[PDB]
Amino acid sequence: VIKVGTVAGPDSEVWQVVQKVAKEKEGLNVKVIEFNDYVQPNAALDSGDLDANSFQHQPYLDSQVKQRGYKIVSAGLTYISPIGVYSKKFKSLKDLPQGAKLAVPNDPSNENRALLLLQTQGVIKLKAGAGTGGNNATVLDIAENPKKLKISELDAAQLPRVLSDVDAAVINTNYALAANLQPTKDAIALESLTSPYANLIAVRAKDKDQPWVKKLVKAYQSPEVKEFIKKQFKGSMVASF
């Protein structure tokens, strides 16, 4: 019995399809264990409670390894989902008022990612080398902030639920979709597909060469799953296979 941890929302939806493919094509018995946010699946994998997880990109895994020394590696890529900026109050970042309130994720890699997107969009400039080379930028690394934006750093999962009280927020696509935001229609700015944020299936290092691993990855990287991703998420998630 293969226990795969994932985050409730689009990932869990995809995994219902993968579960079916894994059984029919690979003879695997997959159980999908859902988590509400990003915090626990690596710890649960490290401890043996899971056999794999499928919720993160490589910069996130790298950050987690730096923090906890997890012996966890990628077994293969799943999809990429360009992060968007959302607003209930403005149609463009150019419309932000003086002293506008923004919210971004507060974990090292996604906070860095959000600040880079804001930099790309010309809203801010980070201090030299703050967000590159593996370094992660925070709001304290902002060198230029012409509009004197007030940037809150909040838990990634909470961001959709503060939209009424900020002028814009940078929100991970899994959470945006779960909150009925559509990245291809509602976002006022969007990250490029040429980013390092493809998501992945992670397993314990010691298990990386087990036969079930390649079989599981094959089940995910299947025509059925690609078709589901295309149809269900309308281009906000792009298969990485």
Q: Can you give the binding site for ligand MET, defined by CB under 6 A?
A: 38, 55-57, 60, 81, 83, 110, 172-174, 197, 199
Rounded to whole angstroms, how far apart are CA atoms 199 and 38? Answer: 13
Q: How far is the CB of 83 from ligand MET (least distance, A)?
A: 6
Among 83, 88, 89, 78, residue whose Cα is nearest residue 118: 83
Query: Distance between CA atoms of 36 and 91, rounded to whole angstroms?
Result: 30
| Distance of closest approach, residue 79 Cβ to ligand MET, in angstroms | 8
Q: Which is nearer to ligand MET, 40 or 210 (CB)?
A: 40
Our CB check for ligand MET shows the closer of 100 and 116 to be 116
Least Å distance between CB 154 and ligand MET? 15
CA distances in angstroms from 62 to 54, 109, 147, 189, 202, listed in the order given: 15, 9, 33, 26, 12
Residues across the chain: 241
Shortest separation between residue 176's beta carbon and ligand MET, angstroms: 9
Q: Tell me whether residue 56 or residue 74 sits nearer to ligand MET (CB atom).
A: 56
Cβ(159)–Cβ(105) under 8 Å? yes
Of residues 102 and 159, the one with the C-beta less far from ligand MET? 159
Residues 6+ apart with CB under 8 A from 33: 3, 4, 5, 6, 44, 50
Residue number with CB closer to ligand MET (15 or 212): 15
- Beta carbon of residue 7, minimum distance to ligand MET (angstroms, whole number): 7
